[PDB]
Amino acid sequence: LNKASINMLRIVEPYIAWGYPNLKSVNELIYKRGYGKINKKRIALTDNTLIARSLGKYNIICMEDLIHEIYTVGKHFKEANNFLWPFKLSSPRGGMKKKTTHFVEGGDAGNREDQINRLIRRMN
Amino acid sequence: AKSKNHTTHNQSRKWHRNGIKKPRSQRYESLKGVDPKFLRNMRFAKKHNKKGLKKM
Amino acid sequence: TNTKGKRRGTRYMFSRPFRKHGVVPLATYMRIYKKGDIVDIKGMGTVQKGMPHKCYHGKTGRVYNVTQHAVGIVVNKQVKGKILAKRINVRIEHIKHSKSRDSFLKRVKENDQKKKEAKEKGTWVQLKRQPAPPREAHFVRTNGKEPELLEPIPYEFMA
Amino acid sequence: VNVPKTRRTFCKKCGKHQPHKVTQYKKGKDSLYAQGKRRYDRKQSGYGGQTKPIFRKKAKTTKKIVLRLECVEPNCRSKRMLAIKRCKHFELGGDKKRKGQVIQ
Amino acid sequence: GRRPARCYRYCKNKPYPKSRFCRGVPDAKIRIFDLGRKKAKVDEFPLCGHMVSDEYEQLSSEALEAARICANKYMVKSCGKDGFHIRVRLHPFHVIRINKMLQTGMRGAFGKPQGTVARVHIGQVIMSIRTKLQNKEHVVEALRRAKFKFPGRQKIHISKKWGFTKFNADEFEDMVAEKRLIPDGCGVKYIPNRGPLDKWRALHS
RNA sequence: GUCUACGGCCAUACCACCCUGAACGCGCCCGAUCUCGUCUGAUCUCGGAAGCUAAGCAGGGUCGGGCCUGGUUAGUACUUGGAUGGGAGACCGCCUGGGAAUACCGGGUGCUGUAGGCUU
RNA sequence: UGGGGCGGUACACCUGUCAAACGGUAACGCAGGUGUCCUAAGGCGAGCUCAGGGAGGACAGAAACCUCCCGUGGAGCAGAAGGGCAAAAGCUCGCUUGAUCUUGAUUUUCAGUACGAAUACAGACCGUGAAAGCGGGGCCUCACGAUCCUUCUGACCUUUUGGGUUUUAAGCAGGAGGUGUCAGAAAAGUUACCACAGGGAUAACUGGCUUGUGGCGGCCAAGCGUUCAUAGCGACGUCGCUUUUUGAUCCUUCGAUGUCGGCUCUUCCUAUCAUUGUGAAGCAGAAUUCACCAAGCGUUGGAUUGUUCACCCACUAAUAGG
RNA sequence: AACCAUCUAGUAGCUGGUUCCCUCCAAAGUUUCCCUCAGGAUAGCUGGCGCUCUCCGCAGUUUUAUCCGGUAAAGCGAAUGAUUAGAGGUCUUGGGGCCGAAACGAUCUCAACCUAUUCUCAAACUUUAAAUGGGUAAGAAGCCCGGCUCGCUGGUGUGGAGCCGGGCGUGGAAUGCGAGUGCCUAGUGGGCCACUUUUGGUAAGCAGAACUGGCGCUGCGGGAUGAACCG
Ligand SMILES: */N=C(\N)N(C)CC[C@H](N)CC(=O)N[C@H]1C=C[C@H](n2ccc(N)nc2=O)O[C@@H]1C(=O)O
Ligand SMILES: [Mg+2]
Ligand SMILES: [Mg+2]
Ligand SMILES: [Mg+2]
Ligand SMILES: [Mg+2]
Ligand SMILES: [Mg+2]
Ligand SMILES: [Mg+2]
Ligand SMILES: [Mg+2]
Ligand SMILES: [Mg+2]
Ligand SMILES: [Mg+2]
Ligand SMILES: [Mg+2]
Ligand SMILES: [Mg+2]
Ligand SMILES: [Mg+2]
Ligand SMILES: [Mg+2]
Ligand SMILES: [Mg+2]
Ligand SMILES: [Mg+2]
Ligand SMILES: [Mg+2]
Ligand SMILES: [Mg+2]
Ligand SMILES: [Mg+2]
Ligand SMILES: [Mg+2]
Ligand SMILES: [Mg+2]
Ligand SMILES: [Mg+2]
Ligand SMILES: [Mg+2]
Numbered sequence A: 001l002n003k004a005s006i007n008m009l010r011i012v013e014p015y016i017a018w019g020y021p022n023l024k025s026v027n028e029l030i031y032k033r034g035y036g037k038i039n040k041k042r043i044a045l046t047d048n049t050l051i052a053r054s055l056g057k058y059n060i061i062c063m064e065d066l067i068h069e070i071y072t073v074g075k076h077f078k079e080a081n082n083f084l085w086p087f088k089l090s091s092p093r094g095g096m097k098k099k100t101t102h103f104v105e106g107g108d109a110g111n112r113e114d115q116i117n118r119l120i121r122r123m124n
Numbered sequence B: 001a002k003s004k005n006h007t008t009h010n011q012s013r014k015w016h017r018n019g020i021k022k023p024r025s026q027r028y029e030s031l032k033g034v035d036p037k038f039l040r041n042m043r044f045a046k047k048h049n050k051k052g053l054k055k056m
Numbered sequence C: 001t002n003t004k005g006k007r008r009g010t011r012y013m014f015s016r017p018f019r020k021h022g023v024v025p026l027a028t029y030m031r032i033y034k035k036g037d038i039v040d041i042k043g044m045g046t047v048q049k050g051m052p053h054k055c056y057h058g059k060t061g062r063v064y065n066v067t068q069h070a071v072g073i074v075v076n077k078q079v080k081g082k083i084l085a086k087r088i089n090v091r092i093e094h095i096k097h098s099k100s101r102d103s104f105l106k107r108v109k110e111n112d113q114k115k116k117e118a119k120e121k122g123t124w125v126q127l128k129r130q131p132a133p134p135r136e137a138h139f140v141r142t143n144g145k146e147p148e149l150l151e152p153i154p155y156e157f158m159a
Numbered sequence D: 001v002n003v004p005k006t007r008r009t010f011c012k013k014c015g016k017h018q019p020h021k022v023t024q025y026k027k028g029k030d031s032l033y034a035q036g037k038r039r040y041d042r043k044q045s046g047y048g049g050q051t052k053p054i055f056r057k058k059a060k061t062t063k064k065i066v067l068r069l070e071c072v073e074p075n076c077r078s079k080r081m082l083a084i085k086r087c088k089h090f091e092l093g094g095d096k097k098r099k100g101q102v103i104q
Numbered sequence E: 001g002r003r004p005a006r007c008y009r010y011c012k013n014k015p016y017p018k019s020r021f022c023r024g025v026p027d028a029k030i031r032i033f034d035l036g037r038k039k040a041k042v043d044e045f046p047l048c049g050h051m052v053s054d055e056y057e058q059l060s061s062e063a064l065e066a067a068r069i070c071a072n073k074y075m076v077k078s079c080g081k082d083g084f085h086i087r088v089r090l091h092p093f094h095v096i097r098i099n100k101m102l103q104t105g106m107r108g109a110f111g112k113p114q115g116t117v118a119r120v121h122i123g124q125v126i127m128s129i130r131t132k133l134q135n136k137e138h139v140v141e142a143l144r145r146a147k148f149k150f151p152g153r154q155k156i157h158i159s160k161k162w163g164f165t166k167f168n169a170d171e172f173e174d175m176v177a178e179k180r181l182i183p184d185g186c187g188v189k190y191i192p193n194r195g196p197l198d199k200w201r202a203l204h205s
Numbered sequence F: 001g002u003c004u005a006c007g008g009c010c011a012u013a014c015c016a017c018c019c020u021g022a023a024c025g026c027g028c029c030c031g032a033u034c035u036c037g038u039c040u041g042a043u044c045u046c047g048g049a050a051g052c053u054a055a056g057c058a059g060g061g062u063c064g065g066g067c068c069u070g071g072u073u074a075g076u077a078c079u080u081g082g083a084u085g086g087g088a089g090a091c092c093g094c095c096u097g098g099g100a101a102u103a104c105c106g107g108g109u110g111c112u113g114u115a116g117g118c119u120u
Numbered sequence G: 001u002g003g004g005g006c007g008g009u010a011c012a013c014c015u016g017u018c019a020a021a022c023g024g025u026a027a028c029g030c031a032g033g034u035g036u037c038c039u040a041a042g043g044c045g046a047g048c049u050c051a052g053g054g055a056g057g058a059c060a061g062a063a064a065c066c067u068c069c070c071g072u073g074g075a076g077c078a079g080a081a082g083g084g085c086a087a088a089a090g091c092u093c094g095c096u097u098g099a100u101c102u103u104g105a106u107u108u109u110c111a112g113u114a115c116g117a118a119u120a121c122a123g124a125c126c127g128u129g130a131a132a133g134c135g136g137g138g139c140c141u142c143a144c145g146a147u148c149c150u151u152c153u154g155a156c157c158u159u160u161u162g163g164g165u166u167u168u169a170a171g172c173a174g175g176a177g178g179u180g181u182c183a184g185a186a187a188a189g190u191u192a193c194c195a196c197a198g199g200g201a202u203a204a205c206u207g208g209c210u211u212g213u214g215g216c217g218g219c220c221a222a223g224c225g226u227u228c229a230u231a232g233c234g235a236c237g238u239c240g241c242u243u244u245u246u247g248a249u250c251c252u253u254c255g256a257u258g259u260c261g262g263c264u265c266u267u268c269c270u271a272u273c274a275u276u277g278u279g280a281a282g283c284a285g286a287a288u289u290c291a292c293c294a295a296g297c298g299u300u301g302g303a304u305u306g307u308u309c310a311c312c313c314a315c316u317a318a319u320a321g322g
Numbered sequence H: 001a002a003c004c005a006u007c008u009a010g011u012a013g014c015u016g017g018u019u020c021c022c023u024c025c026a027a028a029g030u031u032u033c034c035c036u037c038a039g040g041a042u043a044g045c046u047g048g049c050g051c052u053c054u055c056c057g058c059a060g061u062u063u064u065a066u067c068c069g070g071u072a073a074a075g076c077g078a079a080u081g082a083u084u085a086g087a088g089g090u091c092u093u094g095g096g097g098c099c100g101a102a103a104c105g106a107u108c109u110c111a112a113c114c115u116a117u118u119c120u121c122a123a124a125c126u127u128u129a130a131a132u133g134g135g136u137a138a139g140a141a142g143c144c145c146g147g148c149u150c151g152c153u154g155g156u157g158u159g160g161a162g163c164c165g166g167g168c169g170u171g172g173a174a175u176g177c178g179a180g181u182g183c184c185u186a187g188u189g190g191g192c193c194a195c196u197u198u199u200g201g202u203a204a205g206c207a208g209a210a211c212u213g214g215c216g217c218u219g220c221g222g223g224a225u226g227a228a229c230c231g
């Protein structure tokens, strides 16, 4: 986050749903559906070797260090995230209230700070 | 046979497919359209650098 | 169809402001323009000789040529999809030094200063600009009295 | 309009400004033994009728007047043409207009 | 003679007032815009009554005339020849055009002037009636009968202002006693402290 | 303190009216022989320095006008983007963001560059 | 080309608006202008400052001439309007003619090709002003034109054919004669005796959406009705419906939907002319008016006109409308 | 304006038709000129063939600085232009009277003018004046030193530009991504619909524009049904 990013998310408010995710949600997402961009190829994060080859220069040798940088938005975020392929999440179990409108007017779009976790648990 | 006269409807979309390219930027432009008196003099300078070469 | 006259739609653009008619202050003339200096354009009605065409109004460029009383100047005009760098002969009165570049040049000079110092010391000074961050945590001392309760006023029809 | 007969101007050969006697220009008599006239007359001769076009939509009224500028010094006597803007009325050296006068 | 009012109701076009360009206009109907006892001091008629529009529409000059007349008639019968001052507040400048069909057809169809009409925003006052507060309900009944000439919907609101002023009635008498405000016929002059002081001396002397 | 010559920004410096200005300057002031120009030595040009600050100029004054700057007006009017929101239509309300203008009430009235004076 | 024709020129040009705060944008949309004028109304320099108003002075007067004071431009600068200007771009004097010769570069329209128009420089000869400078036409934004042919000017210029001379012609460079349907054929009518390719990109009947016009119907109640607004009516205003009139539109069909009236024949709508039942009347009875339920059953014979429509005679319970 | 054959397969910017599979990519109805408006060229859109570099550059984006803008609104006690209402003035002048011959004596008046106020307006009026937007910059093509040349310009081994030679790397906002470039090239130039702004017209499934997206080229679920609606 920063002014530069948040103004773009304002400009597309109606199409997205964002918020502040919790630690468990970060674990579930990375561990279960982690796939790195290695040599332009979507390859599965199954061993640490696959990380050491690429990110050894930032002392990033494992899933855990990765987590640490993400939660503590450390120095090497750009590289840690650009390494990660966009997360292919499924359709939401249970359903959605109403795609079109904002949360405050009883919808799903826009900033719903914490309730994103509930939504992740319903989509994963 | 009356017919529509002018519009600009799908034009933007045509232009942006291949891109609104910037002009090819380049250091060292030509010196075309530069005050001849000045240009004469610069030409004579480049002509006579040879004479004061040894000191350098 | 409209006409393709040179001064079409310039009823207000060139008109001089309120109580600022008359003579042109002499700084305009007596100030100097080097090559490669970034210069922004502003038409002026008093001098009809050497007015730029209204399209180039507002546009800012760099000076490729100099004469007694004028400067040729490079600008990027957009036409139907391609841009064209093209050069215009403007008499000085319609011109200002754009001050955008000066702050950057101040920052380079500041970094070379800030690098010479804090070099022998070994402290690593942040050179880069860093975007506006999320404000940190803090304490709000409610020293004493309590918050004033605001109530929505009831409606009343003035009209 | 009205313009004066003497005019001081340039000469290419002399290189200076010198006086010139001014007088308006006229069309010459068309030559019968030019090339174009021989060609026309040979094509137009014999049967076939009118071969080349005749222009019939005379729209505009006025000419550009031309000046024959004779140099005055006896060595030169070189003339040259000088074009001017369209004018309906025209005259040479007629009463250079006065200022601050009465109307009758 | 003239057309119905469905045709010229909604605020469709830009305003096209009389000017240099549009000349050859026939004159408007409503010329006497206020009536009653206009020659009257501020203190004797405190109570004001407004008729407020509530739709962005165009009212004709002819309705203005009919409504003024009917209000006059009722107040004459009720409160006598010298107990009020009506003031219509809507001067009609917008000009309306008409496209006549006499075989040319529809080509080059730009209209001649038919007549005038006044544009109205929400919350703009149409009519105002000043008299005493005693004759409040009779004023009401006049304006309620006048609603039927105009279209749409309009509310009948009694004003807080003392007469035709921008000053509330409760603090008014104190202000006039201490000579801030000074009657000046139908209007009233607000004295500030900014002028030269010898004027204040002339006032108190 | 304050001034002159030449200035930059060009009303916080303008306009109107009243009061006070030590010293040198600035001014007004007396003349037409020559240079110069006039209907007219009034203006312009030239030669003087007895008298005077009356005026000009400067500074100060005015519950002054104006101009400049603040608050209030107003989170109103207006508006970018959204919705199977309302409403017979006109038009209106909400979310997300941007955000003004008079009246009214306060405050201000030239800054300054070079060279050279007076108070020796 | 809101069918074509008749009518306009929106067929090349320019100002303001329409334009939605860069620029660019359309309609036979609006308000308007152009095919010229200038020996100076162009060029330098100096010196003057305008419109309007006030108070005075023989003839003198609302208005003739002189004078003081105010005077941010309220006048004027050939022309259309818009922008611009005060010891000036205005007005008055003095001297002049850069409205000359000549390479290329650039801008405007734009295909970013031309013409035109203009802007910055440069080299010559000049003009003026004490001098710094200013000036290569009209204060700015419009006032104009290709190939081919002819014509004039220009060099001790080139060729004119096996060589040499001399006339003539052809060359070369720069202006002019003109194309306004204005990027430029040289051009009058008719066909109901007609012909061919095609067109629903395009009309004349029907069908569709709209309803100005026409037809019908409501609200308020100033007045008529003696009186009494509302038995019966209802002005100045205002809200609706219908598609049997008329117009506006062109989506469908031009490898063909048989285009006006009458005759004959069925059914259907109701906004009820009469009949049945009932309310109200300025309803005594009679006769006559207004309104509700209601369209099951009826609504004529003839003279004149191609007529639908119109007008008239005769009976009738009634001679209603679609 | 007869009949037969030949020139004759006579021309057509106009109708009509045009023979196997799969795979890959995929449009336009707009600019300017034309006796051009049922048609062409010309730019535009498209494909194919490749080529030079890659494992510093670019972007339909924001942020931070910095300029530009004259619509909505608002304003008329500020300019211009219309416009209603009463107050105070004296003559700056005048019409009807009435005691006055008349008379700026007076007399009732009512008139225009001047001063403070007050109701209402503007596509071709505006001092003010937004939101959305259009530009330029955000470093090696840069900074800093030492020194030569000049027929240009100049009181001045002055100014300016141009010439050589060294020295500085935390590469100097956020985010994303492989770029550049050259040939040849067919078809199209009859368009239309919806949210918003908007012009003529009483309006129209009418005529004419801007911005963006769709149909045409595209099937699917829903809206019973439907080219364009919602997903
Ligand atoms: N020679 C005579 N006498 N006549 C009447 C003309 C005969 C021509 N050839 C036939 C004809 O009928 N011409 C008409 C046809 C229609 C046309 N027209 C009709 C309707 C409308 N609205 N507009 C039209 O143009 O008019 C022609 C005409 O009368 O000249
Ligand atoms: Mg389930
Ligand atoms: Mg013959
Ligand atoms: Mg309209
Ligand atoms: Mg004297
Ligand atoms: Mg003095
Ligand atoms: Mg003040
Ligand atoms: Mg035609
Ligand atoms: Mg614009
Ligand atoms: Mg715009
Ligand atoms: Mg020269
Ligand atoms: Mg001029
Ligand atoms: Mg040719
Ligand atoms: Mg032609
Ligand atoms: Mg009707
Ligand atoms: Mg009555
Ligand atoms: Mg059709
Ligand atoms: Mg058929
Ligand atoms: Mg048939
Ligand atoms: Mg019925
Ligand atoms: Mg064949
Ligand atoms: Mg054949
Ligand atoms: Mg066919």
Ligand SMILES: [Mg+2]
Binding pocket: none
């Ligand atoms: Mg505008």
Ligand SMILES: [Mg+2]
Binding pocket: H073
């Ligand atoms: Mg407005």
Ligand SMILES: [Mg+2]
Binding pocket: none
């Ligand atoms: Mg082709």
Ligand SMILES: [Mg+2]
Binding pocket: none
């Ligand atoms: Mg349409």
Ligand SMILES: [Mg+2]
Binding pocket: none
């Ligand atoms: Mg159509």
Ligand SMILES: [Mg+2]
Binding pocket: none
């Ligand atoms: Mg598509």
Ligand SMILES: [Mg+2]
Binding pocket: none
């Ligand atoms: Mg689709």
Ligand SMILES: [Mg+2]
Binding pocket: H223
């Ligand atoms: Mg349905």
Ligand SMILES: [Mg+2]
Binding pocket: H230
């Ligand atoms: Mg949708």
Ligand SMILES: [Mg+2]
Binding pocket: H231
């Ligand atoms: Mg969708």
Ligand SMILES: [Zn+2]
Binding pocket: D011, D012, D013, D014, D015, D018, D071, D076
């Ligand atoms: Zn000579």
